[PDB]
Symmetry: D5
Subunit: 159 residues, 10 copies
């Protein structure tokens, strides 16, 4: 049971999102398999499919191969640079993504306070950054999602 895309309900994504997701659906591939094939993490590979990351030339050749899309089709639809941020309309209505938003809402200042006392005045980068999703089962049989955010600490300049 694999993630698919229906652009009837999901506007403003790049044309290649449809192209990639349609080939993904035809071949019944998971993002884990595609990720492995392109040498990028699962989340980043899915982010790429939603228009939220940039395909290197190697990614383009690797996707063409595993998805069965001719390279020239990807080179022309996946050219230039990502125009990030249109995939999620805020505030999020999708329940799973809403919970992530809720976490920011209820822990924002808590995270800021802790980060500030650990690092000082600055931010955790969302650019010089990686993230991953893991699945875990505990001893009682409960399942847990573990999302890790790892971003570079950037102090505010002094000028």
């Amino acid at each position: 049971d694999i993630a698919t895309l229906d652009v009837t309900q999901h506007p403003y994504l790049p044309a290649y999102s449809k192209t990639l997701f349609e080939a993904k659906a035809a071949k019944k591939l998971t993002f884990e398999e595609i990720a492995k094939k392109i040498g990028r993490n699962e989340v980043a590979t899915a982010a790429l499919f939603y228009g939220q990351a940039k395909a290197s030339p190697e990614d383009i050749k690797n996707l063409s191969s595993v998805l069965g899309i001719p390279v020239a089709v990807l080179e022309s639809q996946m050219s230039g640079f990502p125009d990030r941020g249109r995939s999620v309309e805020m505030p999020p209505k999708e329940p799973l993504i809403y919970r992530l938003y809720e976490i920011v809402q209820n822990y924002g200042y808590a995270y800021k306070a802790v980060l500030n006392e650990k690092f000082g005045d600055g931010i955790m980068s969302a650019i010089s950054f990686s993230t991953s999703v893991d699945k875990e089962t505990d001893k009682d049989g409960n399942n847990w999602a573990v999302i890790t955010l790892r971003g570079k600490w950037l102090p505010y300049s002094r000028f």
Copy 2:
């Protein structure tokens, strides 16, 4: 350099937020020490101070002792249940917090797709949930903040 609160700029927190923070600032206490005193994680303790968590009866006694605030004051001001979600006006303006929001915006559907392929149709709980902040220094000497989200997977029911 410790985290503090000025309610002139930060409205709609509980009255206890000012009472707790004023006392944190006057004792020059870090959230690390307060968290260790109360047996709760740093983020959670910070969250409590911003009105975003509930103090147990033991938390009240322990906060009273380390902050030098009489127990009867905390009991009255920290009674009832938290009314979460007013501390961050959306979209966030504060840069640090904004970066976390941007993460949800740019990765939301990537996260969903990966989580759906690993767990099926459902959510990661923001309720049955924990989070932590850690610091990593890499071999190159640069600092990284690592924020971990860990929430129970809930499938949608069939009914």
Copy 3:
């Protein structure tokens, strides 16, 4: 008189909402009947028609046969995972749905207080959850609608 869908006035539903509802109108089926044939409740069945639930493999088969739609059409249209939340533009403008919104608005803190006193600090899940609609005619011949919401109580973690 049965419920139908006109996508001219109702955007951002999946393509399959159109496919399903046109077959429903063509056969003159009610949701009560469709529901008995898939093994899901009336409300859930209608939520699935509006893109707000996921069809199991058996749902797709049983829908295929009650609606007269080729199994392969529903398998490509109803693949992957729902992207819930787009079917109602908030605040709701349709009067009936608006009343449910108004109830949230006028009772939401009341519910919270009562739930908090009965269960503690937590939520009633909307994921591990079910709902029904029933009709009652009272002693005096007046009709009432009865919506039941049944959600799992989730306490906040201590961490």
Copy 4:
């Protein structure tokens, strides 16, 4: 462990909300107890404390005696007619109340379709209406909250 109010974080409730809850907190009363004394349902009683219902003359004498508030103070503050709808800032930020909102959002059209097929063109009233909260414990020791909405069906007129 009872519900309390801190108007610092919860603006635009009537003055009597503060008077009622301060007495409630001082006497350590539950809404269950207060409701029993005034002969009203628990939810309706809590609604009344948030300025979302009107107290009859008997409700005022009874609230006055159970809460130990001089009856003439309540008479001056609880006069007139409620000005409902200000207690919940939309969309709701408090997580418990948000889930009720998300329900409306994900089930709105579903409820409308089922209700239309059972009653015709009209609404479930939110005025000629009652509601309740019950606790169920299923055979596996898991708690569920059950919220019942019961509103009069009103058909649209023909004119």
Copy 5:
């Protein structure tokens, strides 16, 4: 000079609004004439054309006859239940409609206060309701529009 519709500028109406309005234009009919033929009031009839009312089986027949649209086209386009509320983007931009909104704004609490003193705690229904438009010409020769709203008084239940 009769009312027309151009969907180029008015989105989110049902497909049927175009069909009715095109036939209305083809036969140069006024809403007065159509209303008389279907036995409904002018305002109701116009609302119907904008997707804001339900056509009874008799209305569908009479509409077909007076507009020259085959009864089968109308039955298929006008099936199901109205999804009211999308015709006017709020706040209204069309000046005539804006003035109605300015009245609600400037008189809303006035109407409530006077309604409340006359009827008690409740609402005037917009469901169990009728409305008309009349033209008065005074003795100085000035024309006045008179809009009447007639709604059933509904008191809040005691529960």
Copy 6:
């Protein structure tokens, strides 16, 4: 017995005189019917004035002082100047009764426009050169209905 009141803790951004007028209304247990009869303005208009949405004439000020027991100099100062209408209802209206009127506008707006366009041409019904009232109707069955009448001057668009 049961009269309209104002609690400014829940209702911000009204003129200071709204509080003053409404507190004297409450003390004296007056209805808007009675106050209207004293000042010579209709019930709805009177209530509107109290919510900051109308301008008291010099006679209004004297008559409100009299009927309300407020010294004239106090109304004179508090009710000087010109109303700044539009702040009493935060849009969209949250109060159910008021929301119902907004719902009417929402669901009948274009129907009204179409009917008024066919009877009067291109223009508007004025909300300025305008009156309104509330009546009660009890039908044969004993059911109670509220009847709100909107009476506004027809203004055609100019031609230039």
Copy 7:
């Protein structure tokens, strides 16, 4: 350099806007020449092109003649009544238009106070109204744009 319209960038204008503007572009006509031909001011004439005015039967004939569009085609597209207010998305993003909005913002209460002192309690009509644009060139040869607003004074009724 004449004004033209590109509907790719400017949605929700009536279909006739395109029709008129395409002819305007084809014949290289200014709004001055068209205005002169129809016997209306330039601003009015442009307003009409943007769907914000109603053409009389003579306007239709004159437009037809000057633009080379058959009378019947224009009549079929320009009948009924204007549905004003959709051409400018608020707040305006186009800089020229934004400056007029800023004028309203920074002079609104000023204008109201001066109008109130001159005329009393009321409004300047935007309906019984006309407007023009003129060009002045001063001593140093700078151009100034003069916009004149002339609207009927309407006092609030006493009722």
Copy 8:
């Protein structure tokens, strides 16, 4: 005799000096016409200043002190610095008179742009290098009309 006044209970986020000026304006029964003539600015401009929407020159401060009877030292400390324009009107305007001006921008905006574009080219009419006035005409049928004139400097977009 019926003069504009201000009640800050209902009108937030104006500078402290708005209340100072308007309270003195009310105490002396001054019109903006009279204040404006005393300070040598336009009536509109003078009202805009009272709403915190303009800057008083040092001469303005002296002349306001004198005509309003407020000590010069008070006005200097309150009226110091630079205006922070644009807080006086919550958008969209709910005040009806102000709303009509907003509806004019809405309904005429692209018309004004087209006509301006054809007369002047690619550019704006400034709202900074700008003046405005209010005048009253009375037509042959005794109807009154408000005439608002906006006069702004044309600025072409640069070529770079």
Copy 9:
């Protein structure tokens, strides 16, 4: 690696935006080369491509020639006056642009104070205005982007 446009994700640009970018993409041209060819600044050139500047008759000729587009296509698509301001939905969601908005957010009043103290009461024009982007490489080999805003000082008039 050049900037391209995909209108699937970027609505409400003029028709010519697509025409110009498609040609830029097919010839693999940078904005620096196009800018050099038409004698305009790089930033100004890219702004023209997104519909935010006016092409002179020479620009239309030079663009047509360097891009390999029929001059008559550009003459007609690039007619009229720009309707600036639709290319960025506010608040910006694209991270790079968002940083510019955050700068305005965090330094706006600081800029205002410093500009006021150096020039008096007025604005920096965004109309008599130029801007540029430059790359700086420091001693440690870190790259910096330097954006210069150069606008005419316009004092407020005295009237």
Copy 10:
């Protein structure tokens, strides 16, 4: 003529903004002077007064001295970390600040294009960043405001 603050019109600044600005007005200090005393630029120094920067310990001693405020008052009011982003309500209403917002709107995608072609996929940092304001005079005697943004280029990571 120096910049001052009136908190009556400017809410949500830290308490220290009032304290610093009032001292500034009492001493008739310009930001240029205060900046030179603390060893930061004018813009940074003004940002500090509006709550948008953090004072170092030397800044506090220097501010105290040039402004005449007891070091101890500044130490308690200026403790902790800035909570940036509240000083400007978006979109900006103040005309000067609005023009900067209008530049972001009209040049946002242009900057992004040119930045992308010069640096690749990334952002200009607003954290690792400085900015200045300069006054310039041209050949003709015209005054120009020059705002420089200098931010660190951050590429998106590959993960």
